[PDB]
Amino acid sequence: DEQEEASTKLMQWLRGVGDAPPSASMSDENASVSSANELIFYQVDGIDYAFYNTKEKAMLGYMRFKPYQKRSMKQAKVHPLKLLVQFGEFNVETLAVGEEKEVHSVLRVGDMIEIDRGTRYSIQNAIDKVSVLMCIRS
Amino acid sequence: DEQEEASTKLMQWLRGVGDAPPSASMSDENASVSSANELIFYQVDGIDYAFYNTKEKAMLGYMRFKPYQKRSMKQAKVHPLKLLVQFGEFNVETLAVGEEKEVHSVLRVGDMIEIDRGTRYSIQNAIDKVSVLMCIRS
């Protein structure tokens, strides 16, 4: 249940509900390791982002959405990405290169969507609670 | 609490404790979407793997470890990877190209380690419960 407690503490922090998870080991000093305690949320144009400190920056992180919050349209101009739902529910609208018709998808926890290079995409929190997604860039 | 229930059901399935999460939307039919219900665990050399069905296969998935289970040494020969702890605790041993001294790291939930191209690495479940990690390939 210790590990259930650790998991719950991490999720509550990601959702903005709880305090930062405790430290545990000196492994957070290792070059290749980015611990959860490294994460710090910063707000950009209304959305809270927190990224691990990887060798190539901004390649793995979380987006935290206020209830029903909208992220404006962006384009995967350089890096294809994957969006993986960590908590809650999201509506994602995509328009791939060459197509002229948008696609709307609904994503619940554990669902993933792949955004190809060139695809324009918008994200909206579908529920009246904070939702969290993981952003994985290629 | 509906979304707390969905999150708990997904984690219990990943840990091998519960049944598959329910369906929800027709978005699982969308080309770019890989729903959690797509996941199916298969055992290879003692370890349970489940991968999303992405355009380039085997690029995002989970490894489920029995108590104290060891994954033998592998090498990131082609793809650098990131390992992100989803539940439990792992000891990871790495030997990067050019170095002659191994590095041992301990990872708890939400911690990530980056395995560079050429690095040899071994993984052991550090606890007497099932632990789960996410494997992210570049």
Numbering used by the authors:
A (entry chain A), B (entry chain A): 1274 to 1411
From the paper:
Centromeres are microtubule attachment sites on chromosomes defined by the enrichment of histone variant CENP‐A‐containing nucleosomes. To preserve centromere identity, CENP‐A must be escorted to centromeres by a CENP‐A‐specific chaperone for deposition. Instead, fly‐specific CAL1 appears to combine the roles of both HJURP and the Mis18 complex: pre‐nucleosomal CENP‐A recognition and its targeting to the centromere for deposition, respectively (Phansalkar et al, 2012).
Crystallisation trials carried out with CENP‐C1264–1411 alone and in complex with CAL1 produced diffraction quality crystals which diffracted X‐rays to about 1.8 and 2.3 Å, respectively. As expected, CENP‐C1264–1411 domain forms a cupin fold almost entirely made of β strands forming a β‐barrel with a helix preceding the cupin domain. The β strands assemble into two β sheets: a six‐stranded (β1‐β2‐β3‐β10‐β5‐β8) and a four‐stranded (β4‐β9‐β6‐β7). Dimerisation of CENP‐C cupin domain is mediated by a back‐to‐back arrangement of six‐stranded β‐sheets. In this arrangement, the loop connecting the N‐terminal α helix (α1) to β1 crosses over to its dimeric counterpart resulting in a “roof”‐like positioning of α‐helices on top of the β barrels. The surface area buried at the dimerisation interface is 1,706 Å2 which is about 50% of the total solvent accessible surface area. The interactions stabilising the dimerisation are predominantly hydrophobic involving residues L1283, W1286, L1287, L1312, L1314, Y1325, Y1335, M1407 and L1357. Structural comparison of dm and budding yeast CENP‐C cupin domains showed that although these domains share only weak similarity at the amino acid sequence level (21%), the overall fold conferring the β barrel structure is conserved.
